[PDB]
Amino acid sequence: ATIHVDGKEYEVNGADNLLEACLSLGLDIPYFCWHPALGSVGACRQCAVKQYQNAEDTRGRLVMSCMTPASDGTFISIDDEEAKQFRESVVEWLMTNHPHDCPVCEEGGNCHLQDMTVMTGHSFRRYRFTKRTHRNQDLGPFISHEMNRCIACYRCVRYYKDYAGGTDLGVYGAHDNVYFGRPEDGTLESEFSGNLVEICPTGVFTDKTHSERYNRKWDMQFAPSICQQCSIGCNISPGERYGELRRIENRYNGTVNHYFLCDRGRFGYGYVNLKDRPRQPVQRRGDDFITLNAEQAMQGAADILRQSKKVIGIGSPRASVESNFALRELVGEENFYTGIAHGEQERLQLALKVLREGGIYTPALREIESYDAVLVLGEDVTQTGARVALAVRQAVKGKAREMAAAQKVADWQIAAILNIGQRAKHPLFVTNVDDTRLDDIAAWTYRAPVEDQARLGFAIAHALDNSAPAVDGIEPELQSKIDVIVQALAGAKKPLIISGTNAGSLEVIQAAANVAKALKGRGADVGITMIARSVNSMGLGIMGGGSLEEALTELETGRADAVVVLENDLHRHASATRVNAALAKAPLVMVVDHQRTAIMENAHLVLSAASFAESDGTVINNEGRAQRFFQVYDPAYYDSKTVMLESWRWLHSLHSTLLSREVDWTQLDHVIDAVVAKIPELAGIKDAAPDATFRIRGQKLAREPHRYSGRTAMRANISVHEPRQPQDIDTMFTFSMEGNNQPTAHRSQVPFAWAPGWNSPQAWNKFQDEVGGKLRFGDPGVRLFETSENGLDYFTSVPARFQPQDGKWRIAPYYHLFGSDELSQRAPVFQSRMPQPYIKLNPADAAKLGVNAGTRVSFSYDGNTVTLPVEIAEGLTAGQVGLPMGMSGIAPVLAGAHLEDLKEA
Amino acid sequence: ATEAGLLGKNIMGTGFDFELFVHTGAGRYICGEETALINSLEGRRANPRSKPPFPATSGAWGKPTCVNNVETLCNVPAILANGVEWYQNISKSKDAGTKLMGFSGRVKNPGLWELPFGTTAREILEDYAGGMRDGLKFKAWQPGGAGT
Amino acid sequence: AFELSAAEREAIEHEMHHYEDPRAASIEALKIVQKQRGWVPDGAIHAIADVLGIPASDVEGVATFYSQIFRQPVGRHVIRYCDSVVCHINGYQGIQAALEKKLNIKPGQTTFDGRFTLLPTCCLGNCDKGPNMMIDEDTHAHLTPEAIPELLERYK
Ligand SMILES: Cc1cc2nc3c(=O)[nH]c(=O)nc-3n(C[C@H](O)[C@H](O)[C@H](O)COP(=O)(O)O)c2cc1C
Ligand code: SF4
Ligand code: SF4
Ligand code: SF4
Ligand code: FES
Ligand code: FES
Ligand SMILES: [Ca+2]
C-alpha cells in the first residue's frame, strides 16, 4: 500500500491499521488503548490523525489511526494543527482527574501516560475543579492496585479476559466512575496476571515484589537473560540495584515470548536475594567451616581430587551448558552423571529423540498460536509450561479469527472478530489426571491415569492411521469421544500435539509421537511440542550421561571416593535417605552451588557459585533453541569479600589446577569453543550470541541507562574512593552506561528498551522492525537442530488400563506454577502464594478409608512416614492419590510411584 | 396474536416461523444506541460498537440484525396495507409519510399529534399546542429533544 | 451466605430459554433477584454467575453499569423523580424540595424507618404531563409541591 504522511510517501502493509504502520515507520503517534498483541478498539481516542480524501484537500477529517486501515493511496497528517490540538485535549481530559502522585508512584520514569503527556506538549493546567477518587483493592502478593491513576484505557480487561482468559478481573461502574479490578478483594487467579504491570500504561497495576525494594528504571542495571524457572525459556530483562536483583521485566523476543511472561518467571526471582546464599568458598574441617578465597579453595580441592582414585560428577538441569560441560571435562566423560533419575532421564531422552529425530517440525512459542487444533496429552501445561498454555488459548481463538477474516473484517478490529466468532473456537482436547486450567476453552477434557491417557493417544493414532498399534478394551462412550477427537484432528489444517516429561510416563510421550506420526502420514501440517522440566533439561539430555542412581551406586560401592555435585540438591531426583547415606560414605563431597541446599551439611567443600543474575551461560529451551544469558551485575562490586564465580569458571579452574597445578579461570568464549568442538550436537550454541569482541561501531553494549545515577555515592558508605568499574571479559556488555543501546544498532541482544520520549515498555516498538513483529535484526537464539528428513517407527508398547490394586496407591502428579519449580519456592514472596501441602483423594477412596476433607492421613514412602491433610478431588480416578509435585518433602520423582499404608493418623 | 395464529409457527399457513419477545431494560440511556442495544441484549455492558461492520452484517450474536424504531415499524403496516402510491402522496415533501410531532414545556396544550412532513413549527406551537402559557413569552425551542 | 430460591432459579432458566446465549439473561436474572429481594446482594452476583455459566466479574459489571439494578440496600419504596430538561422547565425543583422536606433525606439516601429511598432518574417519557415521578411501579404526573404529602401517604 502507498500512504502519504505529512506530504511524505511511504510503503506499508495494507492489512495493518494506520497506527501500527506509522509506528513501524518511526513516526510518533500518541496512543493508550491500542496494543500490538491485543488489537484496536478505539477507546482512549488519543491516536487522532487528519485524513484527506485525495492529494488536493485542505479540510480533512480527524480519523482514528488505530481504527483506520492503511489502504493504498491514503493521505494523512500527524503534525496537523487540529490533530495536535485534539491529542493535547485528550491528554488534558485524562489529566483532569489524575492524582498528584508521580513521586510516590512506582510507574514514575516508566509511565506511558507520562511519556504521552510530555510528547503531546501538555504542561499547563487550566482545570480548577475536583478530581475523582477511588478506593483500592488487595489483589494478592504480586500486583499492587491503585485505581486513582487509571485513564480508563481498557487494556487490563482486554488482556486479562480476552487474551489471557482470566475470569476475575473486569470493568464496573459507569460514566466516569469506571472501576477496573476484581469484584471483591482477593488474589488475581490467572497465571499471567503479572503482565498487567506492563499492559497498564499507568501505575494502577504495579509490581509489588519490585515495590518492596523500589528503584526507578534509570537506576537499574539490566541484562538480557533467560528465565530459569521452567523449560520454555522466555527472554527476560533482570534489573539490579545496590547488589540485589530488583525486578524481572519482559524482554521482547518475537519468536518466543513476545510481550508476556508468566507469574513464576516474573515473581519467582526472589531466591537470588536470599541472605543464606554462599558468598565465599567454605571448607569443612571437623566441625569448623573455614572460609577460603578462590585460589586456596582451588589448590586444596585439586590436591584432594589428585589423591582420589575416582572422581565422579553429578550435573543438573539447573546449570547451563558450559557448567555441565566443565564438570564433564573435570571428571571425565564416563564419570559424568546427569542429576536426574533413571525414569526422568529416559522420558527426557525419548522426548528429545521425538523432537530431533521424529521428522515433525517442533514450533516456537509464537508459532503455536497459528495451529488449528490442539491435543495436549498428559502434560499440565498451565502449571508447567504456562506460556505454552497462553499460546494455546490464542490458537483456540484462531477459529474466530478465520471466521472474521472470511467476512473481510480486518485482523486488528478485535471487537468485530470477537463478535463474529461468538463462542466458536478451534478444538482443544486436554488429558490429565484431573482438571486443568485450560478446561474453560477445551473442546474435551479426559480425567484418567497416565496409562489410560496413553491408551487414548494410541487409540487416536490407530483411528487416524490403521498401521498404528490398536488398543483393545475401549468403552463405547470413550470410543465415541475418540472418534470425535479424530474427526476434529483430521479436518485440521495445522494440528498440534503437546506432551512432555511431567506426566511421569514414557507411554504418554510414545502415544503423542504416534499421533503426530499418524497425522504426518495423512499429509497434515502437524507440529509437536514437548515440555521439559527445568531450564536446561534439553541441554543435559543432549549432552547426556549416566543417571543419578548409577552415581549413587558408584558412591555406595566405594568405586568413587570423590563426588562433585553441580547446582543440584539431589533430593528431587532420589530418596533423601539414600542420597544422605551415599554422600556420607563418600570421603569427599564438593558442592558447587548458589543456593543453600540440604546436602551441604555433609559436604567437605562448598563452592559459592553464581546464579543466573551473576553468571553468563547458555541454556536450551524445550523447543531445542540455544539461548545465551548474560551477567547482570558484579557481586564483588559492593561486598569486596564476596568470591562468587561462574560454575564453568570454577570447574575449569579446578581442572587446570588438577592437571598443571596452576590456576587459569577461563574466558567464556573458550568454554563455548570447547563445547562446540567436543560435542557436535551442541555445536549450534556458538551462534546464540556473538563473542566478547563484538562491538557496535567500536563500542560495547550498555547494561544500564545513560542517566544512571549515584555513581560517586552508592558505594561511599564503604569507602569514599570510587572503585574500578567492573570489567566484563566474558561478554560484549559493559557494566556501565558507556555503551550502545540504540534501537537501530545492528544487534539481537537488547538488555532493555528505551527511546527518547518512550520511557515505558512501548519503546520496544522502536526496537522492532515492524510493531508487533520480530526484532529489527532478528531474534536472539538459534535452534540446535533442524527437523529430520525421516521419522521414527510406531511405538507398539501399548500399556494396559489402570487397575486399582488393594493396599497400594498410584501417585498422580499435581503441579503448581507456584511451588513445583525448585528455585521458585525459595523466593519468600511465593510462600504467600503457594498452596497448602495437601493430598488429593477420590471421594470413593476417601469414603472407603473413612476420611473426610481436611483430616490428616499418614503414608510411608521409602520408609518415611509423612502426614498431609486430605482434599477431595472429584475428577481423580479411584485407586489414585494425588500429590503436589516439587513441594517440601515431595520430590517430583514420585510421579507414578506406588504408595503404601496410606492411613489416617 | 400467538393464540390467534399471527405469531409462532406457520403464520397464515405460509410456513414462516417468527417468535417475538419483550426484553425490559435496566435503566441506561446509552442502551438506545443500536450497537449498545445489541450489547445490552447479549447481557453485556451497553458500550457501543465500532461500525463498520454494521449490525445488518454481524449484529446480535454475530448474526444479521436489523434495529429499527417503534414508529418506523408502526409506519410499515400502513405502507403494506394501502400501498406505496398512497404513502408517497401523503405530503408533497422530500420526507414521505407522517411523523409524530409535538410541543412540550409551558404551553397551553402540551401533547403529541401525527402530522405530515413539511408542517412548520409555528403551526405545531400555535394551532396544536395552543401557543405559550399566559404570562410567558417564547424565547427558544429545541426541535428534536435534548440532543438537538 | 446467599442461596437462590427455587422460584428465582426457575425464572432465570426460563429467561435463559429465550436466548441463544445464556449470558443474555444476566440483566433479567439481576432484575428477578431485585424484584424478589428489593436489591441485589453480594452473593447474588456469584449465584447468578454460577447459574448462568459466565464469570462473576461480568455479572458485577452488568449490575454496576445499569442504574436500575441496585447493588446497595434500598427502602421498601423507591421514589424516582425526573430531573431532565422538560421537568426542569416545568419545575421539578419544587417537587424535589418538597420530597426532601417531607422525607428529611437527600437524594440517594434512605429514610430512618426504611420506608422510602429518594432517587433522581432520567426522563420518563412523560414530558407533556411533567413534572413526573415514579414510585415503585406507578408513574405519577402533573406533580405539585402540595400534592406530595398526600401522594406519599398511600405507600405504606
Ligand atoms: C446515544 C444514542 C441514543 C439513542 N437512543 C435511541 C433510542 O432510545 N430509541 C431509538 O429508537 N433510537 C435511539 N438512537 C438511534 C439509534 O442509533 C438508531 O438510529 C435507531 O434506534 C434505529 O434506527 P431507525 O431510525 O432507522 O429506526 C440513539 C442513538 C444514539 C447515538
Ligand atoms: S501513573 Fe504515571 S502519571 Fe500517574 S502518578 Fe504514576 S507516574 Fe505519574
Ligand atoms: S487500570 Fe490501567 S490498563 Fe486498565 S483501563 Fe486503567 S489505565 Fe488502562
Ligand atoms: S513460562 Fe517458564 S520460562 Fe516462561 S516466564 Fe514462565 S517459568 Fe519462565
Ligand atoms: S489508540 Fe486509537 S483510540 Fe486509542
Ligand atoms: S423530561 Fe421529565 S418525563 Fe421527560
Ligand atoms: Ca562474567
PDB file of N, CA and C in Angstrom, chain A residues 694-764:
ATOM      1  N   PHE A 694      32.546  -8.488  20.060  1.00  0.00           N
ATOM      2  CA  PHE A 694      31.519  -7.865  19.238  1.00  0.00           C
ATOM      3  C   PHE A 694      31.291  -6.430  19.690  1.00  0.00           C
ATOM      4  N   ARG A 695      31.326  -5.499  18.740  1.00  0.00           N
ATOM      5  CA  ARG A 695      31.158  -4.084  19.030  1.00  0.00           C
ATOM      6  C   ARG A 695      30.163  -3.475  18.055  1.00  0.00           C
ATOM      7  N   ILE A 696      29.525  -2.395  18.488  1.00  0.00           N
ATOM      8  CA  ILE A 696      28.647  -1.594  17.645  1.00  0.00           C
ATOM      9  C   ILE A 696      29.382  -0.288  17.379  1.00  0.00           C
ATOM     10  N   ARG A 697      29.984  -0.188  16.191  1.00  0.00           N
ATOM     11  CA  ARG A 697      30.835   0.938  15.788  1.00  0.00           C
ATOM     12  C   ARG A 697      31.950   1.190  16.801  1.00  0.00           C
ATOM     13  N   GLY A 698      32.526   0.107  17.317  1.00  0.00           N
ATOM     14  CA  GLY A 698      33.674   0.187  18.190  1.00  0.00           C
ATOM     15  C   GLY A 698      33.377   0.244  19.672  1.00  0.00           C
ATOM     16  N   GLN A 699      32.117   0.382  20.072  1.00  0.00           N
ATOM     17  CA  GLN A 699      31.774   0.495  21.481  1.00  0.00           C
ATOM     18  C   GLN A 699      30.896  -0.673  21.909  1.00  0.00           C
ATOM     19  N   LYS A 700      30.986  -1.012  23.190  1.00  0.00           N
ATOM     20  CA  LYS A 700      30.295  -2.168  23.744  1.00  0.00           C
ATOM     21  C   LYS A 700      28.809  -1.860  23.917  1.00  0.00           C
ATOM     22  N   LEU A 701      28.084  -2.781  24.539  1.00  0.00           N
ATOM     23  CA  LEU A 701      26.653  -2.637  24.754  1.00  0.00           C
ATOM     24  C   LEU A 701      26.397  -2.247  26.202  1.00  0.00           C
ATOM     25  N   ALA A 702      25.628  -1.180  26.399  1.00  0.00           N
ATOM     26  CA  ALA A 702      25.402  -0.649  27.736  1.00  0.00           C
ATOM     27  C   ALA A 702      24.436  -1.529  28.518  1.00  0.00           C
ATOM     28  N   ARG A 703      24.807  -1.856  29.756  1.00  0.00           N
ATOM     29  CA  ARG A 703      23.913  -2.596  30.637  1.00  0.00           C
ATOM     30  C   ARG A 703      22.905  -1.686  31.323  1.00  0.00           C
ATOM     31  N   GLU A 704      23.291  -0.452  31.623  1.00  0.00           N
ATOM     32  CA  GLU A 704      22.440   0.455  32.368  1.00  0.00           C
ATOM     33  C   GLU A 704      22.144   1.701  31.541  1.00  0.00           C
ATOM     34  N   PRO A 705      21.033   2.392  31.809  1.00  0.00           N
ATOM     35  CA  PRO A 705      20.696   3.582  31.021  1.00  0.00           C
ATOM     36  C   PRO A 705      21.699   4.707  31.212  1.00  0.00           C
ATOM     37  N   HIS A 706      21.681   5.631  30.250  1.00  0.00           N
ATOM     38  CA  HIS A 706      22.645   6.725  30.220  1.00  0.00           C
ATOM     39  C   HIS A 706      22.468   7.706  31.371  1.00  0.00           C
ATOM     40  N   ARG A 707      21.305   7.718  32.021  1.00  0.00           N
ATOM     41  CA  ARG A 707      21.048   8.584  33.163  1.00  0.00           C
ATOM     42  C   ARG A 707      21.195   7.846  34.488  1.00  0.00           C
ATOM     43  N   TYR A 708      21.981   6.769  34.501  1.00  0.00           N
ATOM     44  CA  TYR A 708      22.280   6.029  35.721  1.00  0.00           C
ATOM     45  C   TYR A 708      22.957   6.936  36.740  1.00  0.00           C
ATOM     46  N   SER A 709      22.461   6.908  37.970  1.00  0.00           N
ATOM     47  CA  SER A 709      22.777   7.921  38.962  1.00  0.00           C
ATOM     48  C   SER A 709      23.498   7.315  40.157  1.00  0.00           C
ATOM     49  N   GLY A 710      24.016   8.204  41.001  1.00  0.00           N
ATOM     50  CA  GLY A 710      24.644   7.801  42.242  1.00  0.00           C
ATOM     51  C   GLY A 710      25.995   7.145  42.092  1.00  0.00           C
ATOM     52  N   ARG A 711      26.717   7.437  41.006  1.00  0.00           N
ATOM     53  CA  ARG A 711      27.973   6.743  40.734  1.00  0.00           C
ATOM     54  C   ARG A 711      29.049   7.071  41.760  1.00  0.00           C
ATOM     55  N   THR A 712      29.017   8.269  42.337  1.00  0.00           N
ATOM     56  CA  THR A 712      30.015   8.683  43.311  1.00  0.00           C
ATOM     57  C   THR A 712      29.491   8.660  44.741  1.00  0.00           C
ATOM     58  N   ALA A 713      28.322   8.062  44.982  1.00  0.00           N
ATOM     59  CA  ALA A 713      27.803   7.962  46.341  1.00  0.00           C
ATOM     60  C   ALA A 713      27.228   6.608  46.713  1.00  0.00           C
ATOM     61  N   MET A 714      26.943   5.721  45.758  1.00  0.00           N
ATOM     62  CA  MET A 714      26.264   4.475  46.091  1.00  0.00           C
ATOM     63  C   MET A 714      27.160   3.501  46.842  1.00  0.00           C
ATOM     64  N   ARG A 715      28.478   3.635  46.718  1.00  0.00           N
ATOM     65  CA  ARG A 715      29.420   2.842  47.491  1.00  0.00           C
ATOM     66  C   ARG A 715      30.198   3.689  48.487  1.00  0.00           C
ATOM     67  N   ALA A 716      29.766   4.932  48.718  1.00  0.00           N
ATOM     68  CA  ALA A 716      30.516   5.859  49.555  1.00  0.00           C
ATOM     69  C   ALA A 716      30.449   5.506  51.033  1.00  0.00           C
ATOM     70  N   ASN A 717      29.446   4.736  51.457  1.00  0.00           N
ATOM     71  CA  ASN A 717      29.378   4.333  52.857  1.00  0.00           C
ATOM     72  C   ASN A 717      30.463   3.320  53.200  1.00  0.00           C
ATOM     73  N   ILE A 718      30.892   2.520  52.226  1.00  0.00           N
ATOM     74  CA  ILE A 718      32.017   1.616  52.441  1.00  0.00           C
ATOM     75  C   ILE A 718      33.333   2.381  52.376  1.00  0.00           C
ATOM     76  N   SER A 719      33.590   3.039  51.249  1.00  0.00           N
ATOM     77  CA  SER A 719      34.785   3.852  51.086  1.00  0.00           C
ATOM     78  C   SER A 719      34.453   5.036  50.194  1.00  0.00           C
ATOM     79  N   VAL A 720      35.044   6.191  50.508  1.00  0.00           N
ATOM     80  CA  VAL A 720      34.773   7.398  49.738  1.00  0.00           C
ATOM     81  C   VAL A 720      35.432   7.348  48.364  1.00  0.00           C
ATOM     82  N   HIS A 721      36.444   6.502  48.183  1.00  0.00           N
ATOM     83  CA  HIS A 721      37.098   6.361  46.891  1.00  0.00           C
ATOM     84  C   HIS A 721      36.267   5.465  45.986  1.00  0.00           C
ATOM     85  N   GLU A 722      35.969   5.952  44.792  1.00  0.00           N
ATOM     86  CA  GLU A 722      35.196   5.165  43.843  1.00  0.00           C
ATOM     87  C   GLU A 722      36.048   4.014  43.323  1.00  0.00           C
ATOM     88  N   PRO A 723      35.520   2.801  43.268  1.00  0.00           N
ATOM     89  CA  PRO A 723      36.318   1.653  42.839  1.00  0.00           C
ATOM     90  C   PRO A 723      36.419   1.604  41.319  1.00  0.00           C
ATOM     91  N   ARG A 724      37.173   0.619  40.843  1.00  0.00           N
ATOM     92  CA  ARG A 724      37.252   0.344  39.417  1.00  0.00           C
ATOM     93  C   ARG A 724      35.885  -0.103  38.911  1.00  0.00           C
ATOM     94  N   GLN A 725      35.506   0.393  37.740  1.00  0.00           N
ATOM     95  CA  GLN A 725      34.355  -0.146  37.033  1.00  0.00           C
ATOM     96  C   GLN A 725      34.606  -1.621  36.737  1.00  0.00           C
ATOM     97  N   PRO A 726      33.635  -2.505  36.975  1.00  0.00           N
ATOM     98  CA  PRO A 726      33.875  -3.939  36.760  1.00  0.00           C
ATOM     99  C   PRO A 726      34.073  -4.253  35.284  1.00  0.00           C
ATOM    100  N   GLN A 727      35.083  -5.068  35.001  1.00  0.00           N
ATOM    101  CA  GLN A 727      35.415  -5.445  33.637  1.00  0.00           C
ATOM    102  C   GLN A 727      34.710  -6.744  33.282  1.00  0.00           C
ATOM    103  N   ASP A 728      34.039  -6.751  32.138  1.00  0.00           N
ATOM    104  CA  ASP A 728      33.349  -7.930  31.630  1.00  0.00           C
ATOM    105  C   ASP A 728      34.166  -8.464  30.459  1.00  0.00           C
ATOM    106  N   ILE A 729      35.114  -9.352  30.764  1.00  0.00           N
ATOM    107  CA  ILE A 729      35.889 -10.006  29.714  1.00  0.00           C
ATOM    108  C   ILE A 729      35.134 -11.152  29.069  1.00  0.00           C
ATOM    109  N   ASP A 730      34.025 -11.589  29.666  1.00  0.00           N
ATOM    110  CA  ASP A 730      33.320 -12.760  29.164  1.00  0.00           C
ATOM    111  C   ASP A 730      32.436 -12.423  27.972  1.00  0.00           C
ATOM    112  N   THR A 731      31.723 -11.303  28.029  1.00  0.00           N
ATOM    113  CA  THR A 731      30.715 -10.959  27.034  1.00  0.00           C
ATOM    114  C   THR A 731      30.996  -9.583  26.435  1.00  0.00           C
ATOM    115  N   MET A 732      30.105  -9.177  25.537  1.00  0.00           N
ATOM    116  CA  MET A 732      30.181  -7.918  24.810  1.00  0.00           C
ATOM    117  C   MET A 732      29.544  -6.755  25.556  1.00  0.00           C
ATOM    118  N   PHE A 733      28.952  -6.999  26.716  1.00  0.00           N
ATOM    119  CA  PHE A 733      28.329  -5.949  27.503  1.00  0.00           C
ATOM    120  C   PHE A 733      29.333  -5.355  28.479  1.00  0.00           C
ATOM    121  N   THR A 734      29.102  -4.102  28.848  1.00  0.00           N
ATOM    122  CA  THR A 734      29.903  -3.416  29.846  1.00  0.00           C
ATOM    123  C   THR A 734      29.056  -3.129  31.078  1.00  0.00           C
ATOM    124  N   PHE A 735      29.682  -3.210  32.251  1.00  0.00           N
ATOM    125  CA  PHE A 735      28.992  -2.904  33.499  1.00  0.00           C
ATOM    126  C   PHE A 735      28.950  -1.404  33.752  1.00  0.00           C
ATOM    127  N   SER A 736      28.473  -0.645  32.772  1.00  0.00           N
ATOM    128  CA  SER A 736      28.425   0.806  32.845  1.00  0.00           C
ATOM    129  C   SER A 736      27.456   1.296  31.779  1.00  0.00           C
ATOM    130  N   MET A 737      27.224   2.602  31.777  1.00  0.00           N
ATOM    131  CA  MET A 737      26.416   3.260  30.764  1.00  0.00           C
ATOM    132  C   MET A 737      27.229   3.664  29.542  1.00  0.00           C
ATOM    133  N   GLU A 738      28.543   3.437  29.561  1.00  0.00           N
ATOM    134  CA  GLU A 738      29.417   3.745  28.430  1.00  0.00           C
ATOM    135  C   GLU A 738      29.313   2.607  27.420  1.00  0.00           C
ATOM    136  N   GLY A 739      28.202   2.598  26.700  1.00  0.00           N
ATOM    137  CA  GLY A 739      27.952   1.571  25.721  1.00  0.00           C
ATOM    138  C   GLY A 739      26.895   2.019  24.741  1.00  0.00           C
ATOM    139  N   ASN A 740      26.468   1.082  23.906  1.00  0.00           N
ATOM    140  CA  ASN A 740      25.453   1.333  22.897  1.00  0.00           C
ATOM    141  C   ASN A 740      24.169   0.614  23.279  1.00  0.00           C
ATOM    142  N   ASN A 741      23.058   1.343  23.259  1.00  0.00           N
ATOM    143  CA  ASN A 741      21.734   0.744  23.356  1.00  0.00           C
ATOM    144  C   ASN A 741      20.789   1.422  22.377  1.00  0.00           C
ATOM    145  N   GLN A 742      21.283   1.710  21.181  1.00  0.00           N
ATOM    146  CA  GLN A 742      20.460   2.357  20.176  1.00  0.00           C
ATOM    147  C   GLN A 742      19.438   1.372  19.614  1.00  0.00           C
ATOM    148  N   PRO A 743      18.217   1.828  19.321  1.00  0.00           N
ATOM    149  CA  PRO A 743      17.242   0.946  18.659  1.00  0.00           C
ATOM    150  C   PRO A 743      17.668   0.479  17.278  1.00  0.00           C
ATOM    151  N   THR A 744      18.493   1.248  16.574  1.00  0.00           N
ATOM    152  CA  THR A 744      18.936   0.897  15.233  1.00  0.00           C
ATOM    153  C   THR A 744      20.289   0.197  15.219  1.00  0.00           C
ATOM    154  N   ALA A 745      20.848  -0.111  16.387  1.00  0.00           N
ATOM    155  CA  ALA A 745      22.118  -0.819  16.453  1.00  0.00           C
ATOM    156  C   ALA A 745      21.966  -2.245  15.943  1.00  0.00           C
ATOM    157  N   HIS A 746      22.935  -2.685  15.140  1.00  0.00           N
ATOM    158  CA  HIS A 746      22.878  -3.995  14.494  1.00  0.00           C
ATOM    159  C   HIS A 746      23.223  -5.066  15.523  1.00  0.00           C
ATOM    160  N   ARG A 747      22.217  -5.439  16.310  1.00  0.00           N
ATOM    161  CA  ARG A 747      22.387  -6.441  17.348  1.00  0.00           C
ATOM    162  C   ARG A 747      21.052  -7.122  17.601  1.00  0.00           C
ATOM    163  N   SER A 748      21.114  -8.268  18.276  1.00  0.00           N
ATOM    164  CA  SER A 748      19.920  -9.012  18.649  1.00  0.00           C
ATOM    165  C   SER A 748      19.668  -9.048  20.146  1.00  0.00           C
ATOM    166  N   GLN A 749      20.704  -8.907  20.966  1.00  0.00           N
ATOM    167  CA  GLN A 749      20.555  -8.931  22.415  1.00  0.00           C
ATOM    168  C   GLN A 749      20.332  -7.507  22.905  1.00  0.00           C
ATOM    169  N   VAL A 750      19.134  -7.240  23.409  1.00  0.00           N
ATOM    170  CA  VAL A 750      18.732  -5.923  23.884  1.00  0.00           C
ATOM    171  C   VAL A 750      18.519  -6.018  25.392  1.00  0.00           C
ATOM    172  N   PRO A 751      19.382  -5.414  26.215  1.00  0.00           N
ATOM    173  CA  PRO A 751      19.203  -5.532  27.674  1.00  0.00           C
ATOM    174  C   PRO A 751      17.932  -4.884  28.192  1.00  0.00           C
ATOM    175  N   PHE A 752      17.522  -3.767  27.601  1.00  0.00           N
ATOM    176  CA  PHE A 752      16.312  -3.061  27.996  1.00  0.00           C
ATOM    177  C   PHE A 752      15.918  -2.144  26.852  1.00  0.00           C
ATOM    178  N   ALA A 753      14.650  -1.755  26.835  1.00  0.00           N
ATOM    179  CA  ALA A 753      14.130  -0.876  25.799  1.00  0.00           C
ATOM    180  C   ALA A 753      14.028   0.543  26.331  1.00  0.00           C
ATOM    181  N   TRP A 754      14.641   1.480  25.617  1.00  0.00           N
ATOM    182  CA  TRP A 754      14.453   2.894  25.896  1.00  0.00           C
ATOM    183  C   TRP A 754      14.705   3.677  24.621  1.00  0.00           C
ATOM    184  N   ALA A 755      13.785   4.573  24.305  1.00  0.00           N
ATOM    185  CA  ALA A 755      13.936   5.548  23.244  1.00  0.00           C
ATOM    186  C   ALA A 755      13.635   6.920  23.822  1.00  0.00           C
ATOM    187  N   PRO A 756      14.234   7.980  23.279  1.00  0.00           N
ATOM    188  CA  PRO A 756      13.916   9.333  23.763  1.00  0.00           C
ATOM    189  C   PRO A 756      12.463   9.692  23.492  1.00  0.00           C
ATOM    190  N   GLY A 757      11.715   9.901  24.573  1.00  0.00           N
ATOM    191  CA  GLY A 757      10.286  10.104  24.509  1.00  0.00           C
ATOM    192  C   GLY A 757       9.466   8.860  24.766  1.00  0.00           C
ATOM    193  N   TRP A 758      10.104   7.693  24.834  1.00  0.00           N
ATOM    194  CA  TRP A 758       9.433   6.417  25.080  1.00  0.00           C
ATOM    195  C   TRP A 758      10.169   5.743  26.232  1.00  0.00           C
ATOM    196  N   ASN A 759       9.779   6.079  27.455  1.00  0.00           N
ATOM    197  CA  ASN A 759      10.410   5.527  28.643  1.00  0.00           C
ATOM    198  C   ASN A 759       9.730   4.260  29.136  1.00  0.00           C
ATOM    199  N   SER A 760       8.537   3.974  28.642  1.00  0.00           N
ATOM    200  CA  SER A 760       7.723   2.842  29.062  1.00  0.00           C
ATOM    201  C   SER A 760       8.160   1.594  28.296  1.00  0.00           C
ATOM    202  N   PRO A 761       7.528   0.421  28.555  1.00  0.00           N
ATOM    203  CA  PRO A 761       7.743  -0.734  27.667  1.00  0.00           C
ATOM    204  C   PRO A 761       7.298  -0.564  26.217  1.00  0.00           C
ATOM    205  N   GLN A 762       6.717   0.578  25.853  1.00  0.00           N
ATOM    206  CA  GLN A 762       6.365   0.858  24.468  1.00  0.00           C
ATOM    207  C   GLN A 762       7.564   1.245  23.610  1.00  0.00           C
ATOM    208  N   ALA A 763       8.758   1.378  24.196  1.00  0.00           N
ATOM    209  CA  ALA A 763       9.969   1.602  23.411  1.00  0.00           C
ATOM    210  C   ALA A 763      10.366   0.376  22.597  1.00  0.00           C
ATOM    211  N   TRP A 764       9.832  -0.797  22.947  1.00  0.00           N
ATOM    212  CA  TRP A 764      10.058  -1.986  22.138  1.00  0.00           C
ATOM    213  C   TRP A 764       9.499  -1.816  20.733  1.00  0.00           C
TER     214      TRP A 764
END
